[PDB]
From a paper:
Since previous analyses of HHV6B U14, a homolog of M35, indicated that the C-terminal part of the proteins was disordered, we generated expression constructs for purification of full-length M35 (amino acids [aa] 2 to 519; M35_FL) and a short version of M35 (aa 2 to 452; M35_S) corresponding to the structured U14 N-terminal domain (aa 2 to 458). Similar to U14, two M35_S chains form an antiparallel homodimer with an extended interface along the long protein axis. Most of the residues of M35_S could be located in the electron density, with the exception of the most N-terminal residues 1 to 6, the most C-terminal residues 442 to 452, a fragment of 34 aa in M35 chain A from positions 344 to 376, and 31 aa in chain B from positions 346 to 375, respectively. The individual M35 moieties are comprised of 14 α-helixes creating an elongated main body with two protuberant β-sheets forming a hairpin (middle). The β-hairpin of one monomer reaches out to the β-hairpin of the second M35 protomer of the M35 dimer (top), constituting a prominent part of the dimer interface. At the opposite site from the β-hairpins, a groove bends along the interface (bottom). Due to its bend and asymmetric elevations of the walls at the interface creating deep and shallow stretches, we approximated the size of the groove with a width of about 20 Å from wall to wall and roughly 83 Å from one end to the other. These dimensions could accommodate a B-DNA double helix at a length of approximately 21 bp, indicating this as a candidate site for DNA binding.
Residue numbers in the entry:
A (entry chain A): 8 to 345, 376 to 440
B (entry chain B): 7 to 343, 377 to 441
Write the structure that this text describes.
């Protein structure tokens, strides 16, 4: 069973979701990425639940040396594309996990837990309603406060029954619980059986197993405290992971929408170097603006922006020029502050073959700015924003040069 | 075995950092932080291997080890800036040495040997030209790109007029080794592999700081014959062109580094806000970025203090055990307006609050261009200032007190 064991699954598409990319674009990305990095792409593509800042920190994907010239534009495009695959797949994970969590226990399984818990409260002379805890375990509308309360409640019952939670947990290795889920934080399960079974549930979440969650009270048909209390710790701790997963994916969606504006901006610099890509760059811009201004209550759909970015970057690759957005922007800035003109350099600028429809007022316009640290005190660093409207003239001048 | 002139990669005890740039603790911090598979590329880029600044930028693909994943998006730009400064310092030294080797490749007697062999060529061709002018020009750096291409073409036509089919000869030669140590050199068509071999050792010796003078065929074989002298002239001319381009590259690199210090300071500000007890170290980083951009002095910019400050700062960021993701953080701050400073993987609360958290927060206004509309002819961006993180950071401080 590859979907619940400790194995790393990778399908035919490098774990890209189906119906997000063309076969060609899937092949393009696989061929462009360093071979040593393909496993990390497949893992991040999988939707492995994680915070958005962990995704960003783990996204250290290199292109092959032969793509060095476009590395500063192609790597951001690919990293965005992976983040989109992560979001699409992770959304399927979240929905599937939510269903598994809500249906792990049917009426008869809730009754078995609640009966066993009645037995516990009685033996301990406790006034608590066993129905309450069994309902909470099924409840995703649960504060971080109540969660840790219920967990602490379960720990006491365990200790009161003579279970050395401490000793038992210090002898167990929980590392397996988070191999496929970076948002999950494991309670102190008190048996290796439990750890092993719940680790298979967590693996199955990420690897899209179709089986329901295994729980010990169901598997053994047992009302006994060891089975039902660990089971409740599992179900509560999955509910908390799910709440955090939902919030991570919302924050990832917002990041991708904002980053869409930033990527369009650095892809503009590359468009100015290869102005025959105008119609391709226009689509990159319209799809970025569509994401940022979308009104749909529907989720944002990043597939058209990604497709546009990749069809653009393939023509940039064909131009055989160095795309260095920061360098180019810094050179434009230096020149403007008045050979310096980067567009006079063949390694930078690829002159279009017909000029009427590509440069001059036919140049797609985006305002270029750069901010600079212009004063510093012991309390503030002042930045000044510089506008570089001069781009069209410099490009004009590099066209002229080639004549 | 002459390592300074063959095709071997020299790497000193400092990963090719120049001396008197970085403390020893900082050199060791960087060697230990970088993925081992990338140390070779760090040493090669540190060496100053002549290249255009855009080539340095495209090649700066340097990964930190996995144990530093949390700070990767701040530490890597810092390491990459530091390598680019090593590259400027060392390449500035290469340029000065290459300039001296080019200006002195031929002494008086060697100039006489070439002018004599050249007068023979001119006599046998019934040409009026002064052999002195061409020999003077191969030792002159004050040549337009125009006069250069013209002297090459003159040599090329002497070669055909002597029966030398320049095309047949040069097409089958291997010029690979000419550029292994110099990405600015643009080879002429040489006439023999013997020429290419010796000229490749000259170019190797430039980047690897051989103290030998250039080898030329006319000098080594004490020959006046046209192959020797005409191939030598092509070489001295073409290395003269590389030096001119190399000086232009270092000027452009110096200016990128000064402007980029302003971007690095903006990246590192996001991390200061996550770890506000770093205020006095961050303030130094910013003061040093400001000095670089605002210095009136004539003497060259000196990046060593900015680097040391960035490195001292990032060490404290590593210690705080938080994820530094400047674009994520800025997007989240832009989005509000969930608070990233409430997340303990993001924000490290200081112990003394009066000196760090509220109005004691060092201020840098965060500014962001945003795409707001587009047409078939444009993508409209407008610029927006972000609220102060003071209230957001403040909010994070409350949440960790109760």
């Amino acid at each position: 069973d590859p979907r619940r064991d400790t194995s790393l699954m990778i399908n035919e598409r490098c774990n890209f979701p189906h119906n997000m990319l063309s076969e060609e674009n899937i092949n393009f990305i696989q061929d462009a990425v360093c071979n040593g990095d393909l496993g990390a792409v497949a893992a991040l593509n999988s939707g492995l639940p994680m915070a958005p800042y962990m995704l960003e920190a783990l996204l250290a994907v290199r292109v092959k040396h032969r793509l060095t010239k476009v590395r500063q534009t192609l790597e951001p495009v690919i990293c965005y594309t992976i983040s989109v695959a992560h979001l699409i797949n992770g959304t399927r994970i979240l929905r599937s996990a939510t269903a598994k969590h809500a249906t792990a226990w049917g009426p008869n399984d809730k009754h078995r837990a609640e009966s066993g818990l009645r037995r516990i409260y009685r033996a301990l002379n406790l006034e608590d309603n066993p129905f309450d805890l069994v309902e909470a375990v099924g409840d995703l509308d649960l504060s971080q406060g109540a969660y840790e309360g219920y967990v602490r409640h379960i720990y006491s019952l365990m200790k009161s029954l003579g279970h050395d939670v401490g000793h038992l947990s210090r002898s167990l290795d929980y590392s397996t619980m988070t191999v496929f889920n970076y948002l999950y934080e494991s309670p102190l399960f008190t048996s290796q059986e439990a750890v092993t079974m719940y680790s298979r549930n967590l693996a199955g979440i990420t690897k899209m197993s179709r089986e329901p969650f295994e729980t010990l009270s169901v598997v053994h048909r047992s009302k006994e405290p060891p089975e039902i209390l660990n089971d409740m710790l599992f179900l509560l701790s999955v509910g908390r992971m799910i709440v955090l997963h939902q919030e991570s994916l919302r924050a990832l969606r917002k990041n991708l929408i904002l980053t869409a504006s930033a990527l369009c901006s650095i892809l503009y610099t590359a468009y100015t170097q290869v102005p025959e890509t105008k119609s391709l760059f226009r689509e990159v811009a319209h799809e970025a603006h569509a994401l940022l201004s979308s009104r749909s209550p529907d989720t944002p759909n990043f597939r058209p922006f990604v497709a546009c970015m990749l069809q653009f970057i393939k023509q940039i690759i064909a131009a055989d020029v160095y795309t260095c957005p920061r360098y180019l922007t810094n050179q434009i800035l230096a020149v403007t502050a008045r050979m310096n003109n980067p567009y006079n350099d063949q390694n930078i600028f690829k002159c279009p073959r017909s000029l009427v429809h590509y440069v001059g007022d036919a140049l797609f316009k985006k305002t270029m700015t750069q901010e600079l640290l212009v004063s510093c005190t012991d309390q503030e660093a002042t930045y000044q924003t510089y506008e570089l409207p001069s781009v069209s003239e410099l490009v004009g001048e590099g066209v002229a040069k080639r004549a």
